[PDB]
């Protein structure tokens, strides 16, 4: 009726969306290699004839928290965590290359090296890494080199077979896709395998969700949500009062 | 007074737009760099520091801006409607228009290039410099101009604004027309 009902409704709806965005981070505190999503609000003015008094606010995801996660020491050979900044190249079920930070690796019955989510890990050849089937000792190098020991072979047979593809692009050019894999915003952009990133083998990288940061965002989203609801109530209260004009 | 490292921090938004509207500042730090637009309208600033680099637009309407030092770089436009500037220095990197309406401007540097419109409305300027090239419209309404330079390039329409033109350029490539 006054268009301030919808101006406040559109703000209250967006505050719920930001609340859900923060809720996903808290639901994913223990997730491995999880980058917390950032939430903010953007002011978009309604340009047109009349006084510039109506400005909408909509929530967006400007970026992600690319800080180093909490490293968990597991003493497992097939667990690796990226030191500092970096990524691991994996292809999902669609055969589409995407960057990940989950270094919880495993070997299937055929020998292909996958991660906890089943994404095949790429290597120097840019093809999924395949290991000889009857292994005896698998050690992951600090730079990503994979050295294996054939079954029954003596100690002095630690030959390298593959090198984990570690990619360190600009963090501002990466977006989180629909399946948690970060990809270039510009499509058809090759992932250059960096040789500077290092793996801290024997440990797993946790999530970087700042629990306090989400909680203080929640309490501010609640108060701003409630204040706009009062604006909706006072908008209809004014409308009801301004109805006796035609009540002759 | 002057602008310090922390004085400017209180007038900057998330996109580096410096707003000094009616602030009692008289000068800016030497070698000043502003990421975004700079607004110094209605300010007692008399001279811009040398080496000023603006990533946006300049607005100094109704201000005391009188002197600009050479080497200043402006990515956008320079809006000086109603300032106190008397002379325009040579070598200013300007990517927009130069609005000098209601200014005491008298002289302009030779071979000046303006990438947009040029307004010298109500200015005591006596003669446009030879080699002046304007990529937009020309406004000379209410000015003291009565003689045009021999060669000038106005990509837009020249607006006389009332003053009588006694001499026309010999080499003039005009993309528009001439209006009184």
């Amino acid at each position: 009726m006054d268009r301030a009902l919808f101006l406040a409704m559109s703000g209250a709806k967006q505050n719920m969306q930001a609340l859900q965005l923060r809720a996903n981070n808290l639901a994913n505190v223990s997730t491995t290699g999880f980058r917390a999503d950032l939430a903010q609000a953007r002011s978009m003015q309604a340009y047109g004839e009349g006084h510039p008094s109506r400005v909408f606010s909509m929530t967006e995801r400007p970026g992600h928290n690319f800080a180093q996660g909490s490293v968990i020491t597991t003493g497992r050979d097939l667990d690796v965590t990226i030191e500092g900044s970096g990524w691991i190249s994996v292809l999902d079920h669609t055969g589409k290359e995407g960057l990940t930070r989950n270094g919880n690796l495993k070997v299937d019955q055929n020998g292909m090296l996958t991660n906890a989510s089943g994404h095949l890990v790429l290597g120097e050849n840019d093809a999924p890494i395949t290991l000889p089937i009857p292994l005896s000792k698998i050690e992951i190098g600090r730079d990503g080199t994979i050295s294996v020991l054939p079954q029954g072979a003596p100690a002095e047979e630690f030959q390298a077979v593959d090198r984990i593809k570690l990619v360190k692009p600009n963090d501002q050019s990466l977006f989180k896709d629909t399946n948690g894999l970060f990809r270039h915003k510009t499509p058809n952009q090759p992932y250059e395998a960096d040789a500077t990133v290092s793996l801290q083998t024997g440990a797993i990288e946790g999530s970087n969700v700042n629990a306090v940061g989400e909680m203080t965002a929640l309490i501010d989203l609640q108060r701003q949500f409630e204040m706009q609801v009062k604006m909706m109530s006072t908008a209809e209260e004014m409308d009801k009062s301004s109805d006796s004009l035609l009540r002759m | 007074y002057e602008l310090d490292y922390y004085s400017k921090f209180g007038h900057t938004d998330n996109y580096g737009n410096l707003d000094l509207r009616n602030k009692p500042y008289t000068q800016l730090p030497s070698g000043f760099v502003v990421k975004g637009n700079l607004n110094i309208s209605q300010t007692p600033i008399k001279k811009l520091p040398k080496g000023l680099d603006v990533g946006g637009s300049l607005e100094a309407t109704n201000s005391a801006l009188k002197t600009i030092r050479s080497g200043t770089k402006i990515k956008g436009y320079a809006n000086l409607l109603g300032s106190k500037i008397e002379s325009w220095p040579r070598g200013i990197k300007l990517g927009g228009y130069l609005n000098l309406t209601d200014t005491p401007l008298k002289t302009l540097p030779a071979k000046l290039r303006v990438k947009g419109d040029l307004s010298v409305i109500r200015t005591p300027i006596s003669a446009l410099p030879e080699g002046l090239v304007v990529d937009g419209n020309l406004y000379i309404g209410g000015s003291a101009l009565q003689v045009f330079p021999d060669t000038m390039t106005v990509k837009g329409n020249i607006f006389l604004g009332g003053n009588k033109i006694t001499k026309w350029p010999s080499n003039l490539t005009l993309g528009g027309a001439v209006a009184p």
Binding site: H51 | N37, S57, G76, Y77, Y97, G116, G136
Partner: peptide
């Protein structure tokens, strides 16, 4: 008119020479 009053039109800006130049 009031000084410093906001305008109801997009704010002519920098990128896209189009605005930096046209008055």
């Amino acid at each position: 008119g009031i000084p410093g009053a906001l305008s109801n039109q997009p704010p002519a800006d920098a990128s896209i020479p189009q605005d930096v130049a046209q008055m």
